[PDB]
Amino acid sequence: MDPNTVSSFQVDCFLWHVRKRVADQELGDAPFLDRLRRDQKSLRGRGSTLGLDIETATRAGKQIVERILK
Amino acid sequence: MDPNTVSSFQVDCFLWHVRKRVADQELGDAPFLDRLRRDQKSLRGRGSTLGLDIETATRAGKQIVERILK
RNA sequence: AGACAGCAUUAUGCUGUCUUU
RNA sequence: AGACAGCAUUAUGCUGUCUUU
Fold first, then answer.
1. Closest chain B residue to A62 measured between Cα atoms?
2. Do the Cβ atoms of B54 and A7 come closer than 8 Å?
3. Going from the N-terminus, what domains does chain B have, and what CATH number goes with each?
4. I want to staple A61 with a disulfide (CB 3.0 to 4.6 A). Which of A10, A21, A67, B48 is the partner?
5. Shortest distance, CA B8 to any CA of chain A (angstroms)
6. DSSP string across B19-39
7. Which protein residue has its CA closest to C1' of C3?
């Protein structure tokens, strides 16, 4: 696998999860929710193409984000 | 200000900053960088429409996300 | 009715990953 | 050449915010 393809997928998965939690807390406006829906479909297609699992990639993206924010 | 319009802007600003830091660490693929550029333009337009500053909104988004992830 | 951003559907151009004799 | 996702430009439909008769 191309390293940056995988890391970008992982980060994108984690950031989608963050956005979902924001939406769950009733903080999203209608466009924010529209983007959440579009991006869920996008990540599903990307995940399938890569043979990777979004839930697993989410944990990896969390690790990456935690590293770069310290 | 519509509450969810402002919170969505703040979260989006913070998540853009996170993606920029990911890019700076050479972890982004070309599409990831393409979206970073598009979303920068989008946030500038949204910020201008709202009369808000992206840098200040980034800090608010950080607080929101930290609260959400606790 | 205007400004801004997005989403959906279409077109055209392009980028990336992977497969491909 | 195929699959997937995106970006750019353009068309149409729509959503939200704000402004405005």
1. B69
2. no
3. 1-70 (1.10.287.10)
4. A10
5. 5
6. HHHHHHTT---HHHHHHHHHH
7. B49
